[PDB]
């Protein structure tokens, strides 16, 4: 909210989502 | 159709019997509520995209 003082209610912030943690490539055998 | 009704000033013209009927109205009174992520939608998680 860009502020130091947030008002009551209800505010989306965020995602639950994962930042990937490595590299994976893969080719045929 | 088409219909002439027959004005004169010396008559009226009132019903006799009167029936009962039902009919049907629709109205819409709400839609959808969505809502959409900045970035999950326009970057799919790129972090040098965000
Ligand atoms: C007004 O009209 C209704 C029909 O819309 C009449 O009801 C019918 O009456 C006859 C004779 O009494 C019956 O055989 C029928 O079964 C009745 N129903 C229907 C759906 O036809 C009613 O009698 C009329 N009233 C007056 C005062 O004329
Ligand atoms: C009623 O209708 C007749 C025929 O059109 C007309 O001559 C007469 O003047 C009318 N009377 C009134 C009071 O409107």
């Given at each position: 909210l860009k502020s130091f003082t947030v008002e009551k209610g209800i505010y989306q912030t965020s995602n639950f989502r994962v930042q990937p943690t490595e590299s994976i490539v893969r080719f045929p055998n | 159709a088409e219909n002439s009704v027959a004005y004169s000033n010396n008559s009226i013209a009132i019903p006799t019997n009167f029936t009962i009927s039902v009919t049907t109205e629709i109205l819409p009174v709400s839609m959808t509520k969505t809502s959409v992520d900045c970035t999950m939608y326009?970057?799919?998680?790129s972090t040098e995209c965000s």
């Open positions: - | 326009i970057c799919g998680d």
